[PDB]
Design a protein around this ligand. Structure first.
Ligand SMILES: Cc1cc2nc3c(=O)[nH]c(=O)nc-3n(C[C@H](O)[C@H](O)[C@H](O)COP(=O)(O)OP(=O)(O)OC[C@H]3O[C@@H](n4cnc5c(N)ncnc54)[C@H](O)[C@@H]3O)c2cc1C
Ligand SMILES: Cc1cc2nc3c(=O)[nH]c(=O)nc-3n(C[C@H](O)[C@H](O)[C@H](O)COP(=O)(O)OP(=O)(O)OC[C@H]3O[C@@H](n4cnc5c(N)ncnc54)[C@H](O)[C@@H]3O)c2cc1C
Lengths: 473, 473
């Protein structure tokens, strides 16, 4: 629940053509794009939407919370629906997959009620997102025909759509489900591990990489998180390649590189790939298939835009085109495309891949590049860190230690990334670093940056300042 | 006590100069400056310090916490002392006021142990700070010659030095002190009002301005804080000029131009003014008497610097010279003056007057200009505000509303200030805006800034993004 009127971008419509705008996909990106277009230019344009799913505007980010019983039910996991979009002026086709696009005649063909539906367009917006990847695992295959990623082996699950989360939660009811294996230690696999453990199941987290949250946090924080999970009953099996998921009629064992585990359910959280096949090669693609787009979210074909997990985005930390699959980027890229497709020139500004994670009371946040990542990409990076209490030691209650890492370029001196971890929520602080990187602020300028002081809130020489002042080179 | 090794600014000694450097004053500004010089350039320079007080390196910021018994006395309110500074390499003179400066023979004269002591210098750093403001009030006079702001009338108090607090606490135990009047409704007056209230005394907060926290927060938030204090029995008497403090040998009643109040003690917290008497008309001063300094904290007299509360500072919100008496600025100007004084070219970057306040569980933070203040300064400013919960509606516990205000220039579009209030600590969020104002970020660019999303921490359409998108002007 977060609605409003027009944005500060909304521009007076004058001397511009009216446009029929077709949107393919209506989840985070599509919904954000559609709402901005309608609430800002309303009747000026004709918005037609197609989504192959039976539901839209779902919050996948809330699936772990729901499975782990951290929230009552799935009610609040939807931020819009067909009726709401239509009440804004959109024409919406549910369970209608667009199956081909003719860029010359400017029409899309979608399967509406078992029949081919041709829809003309002036502007086309791709918000088709992505789909989960199936690693080469014996016993793991998908049932042909389903757009819901159903596994052939009972109790082997994928976790992307609402149905997937509902499916898992139903099965968890079965008293036989006692041991669950989660494959993939990225942020999704980690949250799911906590979720299943929170449901009382024995959990084993498997990944071929040597730690969890690889690429988002440095060694000491991924170690802290791993420790966090272990001390909660989650068994860690890092550095192991899954070979097979076996079982007679259902999941009964998961076999890896270095071991075998008796489990009653397997969850695959290894990654996703963008849905850009509708491009038919006509559109330039990023190395991973994502639609390549500029700062206005426009593809190599004029009039055709791409947003969210199906397209790329500019990364101000690496300072190159990149692919960052986050609902946060979906919302913002959707807003940008909305204005541009409606005739308002709006240049996006890139992102930093800012993220947060909260598992069993361990709170962390990061933005930009970790020291490992920065180095691995040829940056002459260094890190300055500091661990200290949030408030002055004389504060009798509510104090706590915070660990902060500030990764910067030894050469250019600009901040490349930052990470924070604490047993209390200090996430609001990562916003500063997100902006820092965006603006190219250096470790030297940060050190003297005005960070207020109030003993009730912080120390005169807070950890941000101490970290920056303590940088070397 | 927040010690550390060398800063990232430390420049390797090459053909530079070693100097005899005299520092006048050793509270927040002097201490920070002396430590930076000695820790970064040790033996190269000769540091001599003079302070007229019997205690140095005190955290005046904790006085209300101390008085209101929120902490264990003043045990943690000192961040250094004579022996510490001497061990770092400085010669320290306590209870030794500097009475005159000979800018020609570059020497200062201090009253040491009663006799006159002369000290020559290559560089001079003024850190004489400020003194409380004392408007024309009958019966309110500081005893001639006291260096501790002692009022001639018994039970009329100032709250600036360590002694002033111990003095109030001393008289506070007097079972006869029942009603206490606090003159000045700025953050210090509000904090002291709460302190005396916690001591079970009846408090009446008087100020000429018709509101509390004038210039720090806009009317709806100051209304919030006013109602907050009244919720705890504090009486408010705004829009009144204190004309006289009267009584038979002691305080018995305070009279304004509109009313009269029967009180047993009066605390004057009208504000502070720079202590720049030692300038002797030889140094350029700012409109309020503060030593006018440049980006390097150097005065109009080469070789002479001024830091903290006795000097000006550059304000990036107004984009001009200004006076902002805060420990945060005291510390930073000290660091900059120290390096430049020791031969390292270091240009300060200005501040935003960022601040915070926490009273009876109401936490507020602001930075830069309020709409009313921006306008009082001639800016064609506008504000965009928003109120929503910190997290998604489906969050079981730990959720709370937050009100945010972003003030911006309707013409240049750059952010001028920002305010936030909630009953849960969101103070970390103001750092982003302080940095945003520093970097001249526009309201349009702010709206697309990469604000991460995690249901446990915030909403996809968080209030920062919503308020920004909501810019109307
Ligand atoms: C468990 C989990 C937790 C997550 N947590 C967070 C988090 O805490 N914070 C964060 O920022 N992000 C999080 N994410 C990521 C976020 O959910 C995605 O980045 C976001 O959903 C992408 O939105 P989208 O609209 O681009 O694409 P998608 O959500 O992939 O949606 C694409 C839509 O288009 C439709 N579609 C596809 N092809 C066609 C077609 N051919 N014709 C018609 N319709 C079509 C699909 O049915 C779908 O509705 C999480 C994801 C998961 C799975
Ligand atoms: C009740 C209260 C609450 C506050 N709360 C906050 C807060 O929460 N956050 C924040 O950022 N700031 C706060 N402040 C402001 C902060 O305390 C000041 O900004 C800071 O102390 C200024 O440090 P300074 O060294 O520049 O000056 P001062 O503290 O004024 O010290 C100047 C020093 O120089 C000495 N001196 C002066 N003249 C001479 C002389 N002629 N010869 C020799 N020595 C001399 C004095 O004895 C003194 O020790 C608060 C202040 C008060 C009083």
């Amino acid at each position: 629940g977060q609605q409003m009127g027009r944005t500060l971008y909304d521009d007076d419509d004058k001397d511009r053509w009216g446009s029929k705008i077709v949107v393919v996909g209506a989840n985070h990106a599509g919904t954000a794009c559609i709402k901005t277009m309608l609430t800002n230019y309303g009747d000026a344009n004709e918005i037609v939407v197609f989504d192959q799913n039976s539901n839209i505007s779902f919050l996948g980010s809330g699936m772990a919370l729901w499975i782990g019983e951290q929230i009552a039910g799935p009610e609040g996991l939807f931020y819009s629906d067909k009726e709401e979009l239509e009440s804004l002026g959109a024409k919406v086709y549910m369970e209608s997959p667009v199956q081909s696009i003719d860029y010359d005649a400017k029409t899309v063909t979608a399967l509406v009620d078992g029949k081919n539906h041709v829809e003309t367009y002036d502007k086309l917006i791709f918000a088709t997102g992505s789909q989960p990847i199936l690693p080469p695992i014996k016993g793991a295959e998908i049932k042909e025909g389903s757009l819901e990623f159903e596994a052939t082996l009972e109790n082997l699950q994928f976790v992307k759509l609402y149905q997937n989360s509902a499916d898992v939660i139903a099965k968890l009811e079965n008293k036989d489900i006692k041991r669950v294996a989660v494959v993939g230690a990225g942020y999704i696999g980690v949250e799911l591990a906590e979720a299943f453990q929170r449901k009382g199941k024995e959990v084993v987290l498997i990944d071929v990489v040597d730690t969890c949250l690889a690429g988002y946090y440095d060694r000491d924080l991924t170690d802290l998180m791993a420790k966090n999970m272990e001390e909660h009953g989650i068994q860690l099996a890092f550095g192991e390649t899954v070979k097979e998921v076996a079982g007679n009629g259902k999941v009964e064992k998961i076999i890896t590189d270095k071991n075998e585990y008796d489990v009653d359910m397997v969850i695959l959280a290894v990654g996703f790939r963008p849905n850009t096949t509708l491009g038919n090669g006509k559109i330039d693609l990023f190395r991973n298939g994502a639609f390549l787009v500029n700062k206005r979210q426009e593809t190599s074909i004029p009039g055709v835009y791409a947003i969210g997990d199906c397209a790329t985005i500019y990364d101000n930390a690496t300072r190159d085109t990149n692919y960052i699959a986050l609902a946060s980027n979906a919302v913002r890229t959707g807003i940008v495309a909305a204005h541009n497709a409606c005739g308002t020139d709006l240049e996006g500004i890139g992102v930093q891949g800012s993220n947060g994670i909260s598992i069993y009371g361990l709170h962390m946040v990061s933005t930009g590049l970790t020291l490992e990542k920065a180095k691995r990409l040829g940056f002459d990076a260094a890190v300055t860190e500091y661990t200290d209490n949030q408030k002055p030691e004389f504060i009798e209650h509510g104090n706590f230690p915070v660990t902060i890492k500030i990764v910067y370029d030894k050469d250019s001196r600009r901040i490349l990334g930052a990470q924070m971890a604490a047993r209390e929520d200090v996430s609001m602080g990562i916003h500063m670093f997100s902006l820092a990187i965006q603006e190219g602020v250096t470790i030297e300028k940060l050190a003297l940056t005005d960070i207020f002081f109030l003993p009730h809130f912080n120390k005169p020489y807070n950890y941000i300042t101490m970290a920056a002042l303590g940088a070397k080179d």
